[PDB]
Structure 1
Amino acid sequence: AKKVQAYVKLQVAAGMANPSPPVGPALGQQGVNIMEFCKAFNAKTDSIEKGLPIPVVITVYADRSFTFVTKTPPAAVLLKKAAGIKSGSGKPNKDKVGKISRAQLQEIAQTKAADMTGADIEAMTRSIEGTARSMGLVVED
């Protein structure tokens, strides 16, 4: 989040094994190796859990390897494995497609290590629900 040299992030999942059909070798071509996806990337993710997609920046200037740090996984996947349905919309707004709870996505949204905008707890409480209830859900906060 500094300047040019094209910060990028491509992912479908972190638990599986770098698929070719969905993204392929598009995970780096200007100094990023394709065999290093399981050398240093699988240093802290493999020790906790493998069920979520994960974005990451590259941030390589001229080095053969990479020198980036992992960050939070997206909140758009917490609505599938931890909140309810997997497939989703169907007809997005012909009826009341989904259901959410106020206690839901409270501790799940707080598991992020460090990626915040403001230290207030009340302000960030309704930050995640912006991604929510755009799916055709009903809010009962």
Structure 2
Amino acid sequence: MKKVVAVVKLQLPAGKATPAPPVGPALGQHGANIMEFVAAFNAATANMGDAIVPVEITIYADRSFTFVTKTPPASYLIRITWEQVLEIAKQKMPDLNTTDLEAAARMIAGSARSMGVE
């Protein structure tokens, strides 16, 4: 610590981030190293292929940063309802706020219905 000055929430394609917006202005307004983030994000999400990656960039007062990539979103993982949530419910553990390993599938399958997926 290391005072936090910003927490930037973005959603970027895996391994194909660029210094172009939103990354440019989103990190640039706080003086964070854009090229450093671009290189690091791309390597961290490299194997994921075409998956849409939500990312949280924490920017500090010394202009340095750290970031956390996400699960990612259910709306991507949905795209015909089969035994989808036998592993998706275990995927949404570090994304959903509910403090239970089991109580998640009872909400993902319902949210899948309106898309509309049968």
| Shared fold (TM-score, shorter chain, > 0.5) | yes
The runs of at least 4 aligned residues of structure 1 exceeding 6 Å deviation read none
Structure 1 residue runs of 5 or longer lacking an equivalent are 81-98
Larger % of helix: which?
2
Q: TM-score, length-normalised on structure 1?
A: 0.60
Q: CA deviation at 1:7?
A: 2.9
- The within-5 A match list for 1:88-99 is 99=80
Q: CA deviation at 1:6?
A: 5.0
Question: What is residue 14 of structure 2 aligned with on the other side?
Answer: 14
Q: Alignment identity in percent?
A: 51
- State which structure, 1 or 2, has the greater radius of gyration over its C-alpha atoms: 1
Q: 1:112 to 1:135 in 2, by over 3 A?
A: closer
Question: What is residue 69 of structure 1 aligned with on the other side?
Answer: 68
Q: TM-score, length-normalised on structure 2?
A: 0.69
Structure 2 residue runs of 5 or longer lacking an equivalent are none
Larger % of strand: which?
2
- Tell me the distance in 2 between the aligned counterparts of 1:55 and 1:37: 14
C-alpha contact 1:56 1:70 (8 A) present in aligned 2: yes
RMSD of aligned Cα (Å):
2.9
Question: CA deviation digits over 1:69-102, x for unaligned, max 9?
Answer: 333211111123xxxxxxxxxxxxxxxxxx212x
Kindly indicate whether residue 94 of structure 2 is the aligned counterpart of residue 114 of structure 1: yes
C-alpha contact 1:27 1:34 (8 A) present in aligned 2: no
